Amino acid sequence: GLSDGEWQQVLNVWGKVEADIAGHGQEVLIRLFTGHPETLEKFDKFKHLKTEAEMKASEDLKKHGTVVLTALGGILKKKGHHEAELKPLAQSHATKHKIPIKYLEFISDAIIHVLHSKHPGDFGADAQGAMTKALELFRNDIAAKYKELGFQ
């Protein structure tokens, strides 16, 4: 897992996100959808968004960004002791939403990109290393639940 020092870096970085949860959430989803248009097709409520302008202007997209990052933040604050929080998310994403694990890799990469974009020069090598590890742990625990379900 992550060391105590690594968790402290993760949660320090997360303070930056919490100062503007909707803004970070919106940018993460826009990075995901523009980089990987197939992902948009999993959202019946966003498939009408035909341009980035329309995405940027969507209050509902910002709302979902808030829901996503709030869930992720609750998970990160558990510092790996996240079974109860993570199991239901993994199961809804496999069974209801049909989200392949590759798309979770995509959104993980989008989070790292958005952190650099919004905090250039303020997201250092140690911070990126710790946040990467945290997102890998998140993805890996979801993947174990996916394997249990035989999903993908």
CB closer to ligand HEM out of 43 and 151? 43
d(Cα 44, Cα 90) in Å, to the nearest integer? Answer: 19
| 64 annotated among ligand-binding-site residues | yes
d(Cα 125, Cα 127) in Å, to the nearest integer? Answer: 5
Q: Which of residues 26-45 bind ligand HEM (CB under 6 A)?
A: 39, 42-43, 45
Name which position in 3, 12, 92, 95 contacts ligand HEM (CB under 6 A): 92
Name which position in 17, 55, 61, 68 contacts ligand HEM (CB under 6 A): 68
| 113 annotated among ligand-binding-site residues | no
d(Cα 73, Cα 14) in Å, to the nearest integer? Answer: 7
d(Cα 37, Cα 39) in Å, to the nearest integer? Answer: 5
Q: Does 9 bind ligand HEM (CB under 6 A)?
A: no
Would you say the C-alpha torsion 68, 105, 113, 42 has a positive or negative sign?
negative
C-alpha closest to that of 137 among 10, 15, 5: 10
CB of 135 to ligand HEM, least distance (A): 8
CB of 75 to ligand HEM, least distance (A): 7
Under rule CB under 6 A, how many of the chain's residues touch ligand HEM? 16
CB of 56 to ligand HEM, least distance (A): 18
Question: DSSP assignment of 100-134, as one string?
Answer: -HHHHHHHHHHHHHHHHHHSTTSS-HHHHHHHHHH
Q: Does 107 bind ligand HEM (CB under 6 A)?
A: yes
Q: For binding to ligand HEM (CB under 6 A), which residues are involved?
A: 39, 42-43, 45, 67-68, 71-72, 89, 92-93, 97, 99, 103-104, 107
